[PDB]
């Protein structure tokens with residue numbers, strides 16, 4: 001497997017990088033909250049009348 | 050059922066059996082010739098099937114888990130050895 | 133035993149849901165490791181110059197001499213935890229060896245219990261840790277919000293000092309003292325990991 | 331009948347235990363969703379990688395079958411450029427540090443800008459402050475500071 | 479054989495139930511570790527004792 005693209009940022013002690021533009025990003029995050037509510041009758045499941 | 054091999058276990062002369070932690074026989078004393086035999090289970094392991102979807106292809110690959118590539122019999126010519 | 137299997141077939145599908153629960157746990161472990169460590173999209177690396185304003189990161193950056201590219205502190209942490217091999221490298225080959233001292237792992241494997249290897253090897257976890265350290269050292273917090281933006285480490289520490297509520301002239305007039313205190317703290321981390329085993 | 335009763339009772343207890351474990355997991359996820367609704371939607375969050383990737387601006391809830399969907403609106407810097415930086419400016423034996431922003435240079439002249447966007451400005455006593463002299467800060471450069 | 483099957487099945491079910499509870503605890507700790515990696519390493523945190 002590949003962990004990602006290899007990068008090497010140009011670091012020095014008197015150089016800085018500053019952005020000149022921007023983007024507005026909309027992302028989607030999905031979260032469960034509740035599940036199905038169930039009920040079980042033993043006398044009809046185990047025995048059945 | 051198993052594989053019997055020669056042993057170097059130091060059996061005392063009054064001892065005829067050797068047991069395991071899970072209470073199974075690891076070593077036996079042969080009754081005719083007084084010899085000690087180690088018993089091991091025969092080769093086994095799990096089989097996993099790697100496939101794409103059946104709407105894509107019917108080709109499969111087989112992963113034999115935890116066993117070396119020289120012991121699996123008793124495409125598909127592309128044998129590879131993973132961990 | 134065929135008779136035991138024919139009697140066990142009458143008990144339904146307990147084994148299948150048991151296997152399903154164990155498979156779900158096994159997938160969840162790899163998901164946990166991937167969601168903790170694989171948080172960076174690109175593998176950053178440290179430039180060959182090793183000056184960061186007087187701060188010494190020689191113990192957390194990887195050492196290329198070892199075959200596993202791990203740092204000194206990572207090697208100490210890996211040596212302190214006595215991790216069993218857990219039957220990874222062909223346990224049936226090792227259990228076939230004629231040794232009088234029978235292991236517990238051989239009994240576990242012979243009684244049907246198997247340990248699966250993780251998806252990410254320790255070298256990949258070390259590579260992710262190295263990429264995170266290189267990005268944090270050479271870009272600050274920018275690499276977690278887009279592209280990595282380079283900045284000198286003294287200016288980055290002045291930004292951190294402004295973040296906690298201290299003026300940056302406190303850093304710039306006490307830079308060597310702060311670097312020496314950080315290096316002494318890293319050396320104390322060395323000594324506490326080499327000495328204390330709990 | 332006793333054998334069948336024991337088997338069916340064991341199956342029912344297995345189902346109830348699995349449902350309890352899944353209920354604990356679903357409750358943890360619902361608590362996380364409630365925290366994200368309280369912090370992402372009802373305010374602005376400074377926590378990194380909470381409420382989306384990037385600098386968080388807004389969030390919008392949407393209902394879903396057995397769940398919630400958050401639309402996270404974030405700010406991403408786009409087009410970076412190289413500049414020459416310095417920690418302070420030496421002027422009349424005085425060290426000037428920026429109030430908000432960073433000193434940059436485009437090769438010939440020095441400006442002061444803000445960190446997240448390139449908006450250069452003339453270095454002035456209004457946007458800088460004076461602390462100490464020039465033989466303490468490492469990397470200090472020489473420039474005049476404008477006075478209005 | 480039926481007695482042995484019932485006993486070994488009960489032991490296996492006990493092991494898997496304990497493994498499920500431990501996996502839930504480990505997943506909670508991994509979520510905490512991922513949050514600490516996102517908020518401590520990738521940025522600066524204002525939360526006290528975080």
Ligand SMILES: *[C@@H]1O[C@H](CO)[C@@H](O[C@@H]2O[C@H](CO)[C@@H](O)[C@H](O)[C@H]2NC(C)=O)[C@H](O)[C@H]1NC(C)=O
Pocket residue numbers: 020021022023409
């Ligand atoms: C910043 O980026 C935006 C795009 O995200 C640029 O807007 C584009 O500009 C070109 C040329 O003027 C147009 O052809 C496109 O239609 C624009 N895209 C839009 C409006 O979505 C903008 O020019 C960039 N600004 C700078 C200063 O680089």
Ligand SMILES: *[C@@H]1O[C@H](CO)[C@@H](O[C@@H]2O[C@H](CO)[C@@H](O)[C@H](O)[C@H]2NC(C)=O)[C@H](O)[C@H]1NC(C)=O
Pocket residue numbers: 188189190191
């Ligand atoms: C950065 O710290 C490392 C410690 O990991 C220093 O390396 C050690 O220096 C001592 C001398 O005090 C030697 O005895 C060790 O053998 C060195 N360990 C190595 C090279 O792995 C290193 O000198 C420091 N860098 C500085 C001060 O620039």
Ligand SMILES: *[C@@H]1O[C@H](CO)[C@@H](O[C@@H]2O[C@H](CO)[C@@H](O)[C@H](O)[C@H]2NC(C)=O)[C@H](O)[C@H]1NC(C)=O
Pocket residue numbers: 436437438439
């Ligand atoms: C750095 O930026 C300054 C911004 O003032 C540049 O100065 C101006 O440059 C334009 C040409 O791009 C000239 O027409 C103006 O007369 C200059 N203004 C002055 C000198 O006050 C400067 O040229 C830039 N330097 C570089 C190397 O790009």
Ligand SMILES: *[C@@H]1O[C@H](CO)[C@@H](O)[C@H](O)[C@H]1NC(C)=O
Pocket residue numbers: 012013181183
């Ligand atoms: C700054 O960087 C240059 C080249 O990268 C180096 O020669 C110089 O020694 C550095 N400054 C300090 C104070 O180490």
Ligand SMILES: *[C@@H]1O[C@H](CO)[C@@H](O)[C@H](O)[C@H]1NC(C)=O
Pocket residue numbers: 081082
């Ligand atoms: C039984 O076999 C052993 C070894 O083969 C031999 O020494 C012994 O004399 C035999 N006993 C009889 C009664 O033949």
Ligand SMILES: *[C@@H]1O[C@H](CO)[C@@H](O)[C@H](O)[C@H]1NC(C)=O
Pocket residue numbers: 117118119130222225
């Ligand atoms: C197991 O496989 C390895 C490499 O595939 C090999 O070196 C080793 O000899 C094998 N073990 C056997 C054949 O017992």
Ligand SMILES: *[C@@H]1O[C@H](CO)[C@@H](O)[C@H](O)[C@H]1NC(C)=O
Pocket residue numbers: 010017410411412
């Ligand atoms: C800045 O300079 C480095 C090294 O000179 C170069 O690799 C890079 O492309 C330049 N531009 C940006 C936006 O980083």
Ligand SMILES: *[C@@H]1O[C@H](CO)[C@@H](O)[C@H](O)[C@H]1NC(C)=O
Pocket residue numbers: 420470471472
């Ligand atoms: C800045 O000016 C002073 C005298 O005004 C001089 O001593 C010093 O060397 C100058 N700094 C640089 C970097 O040239």
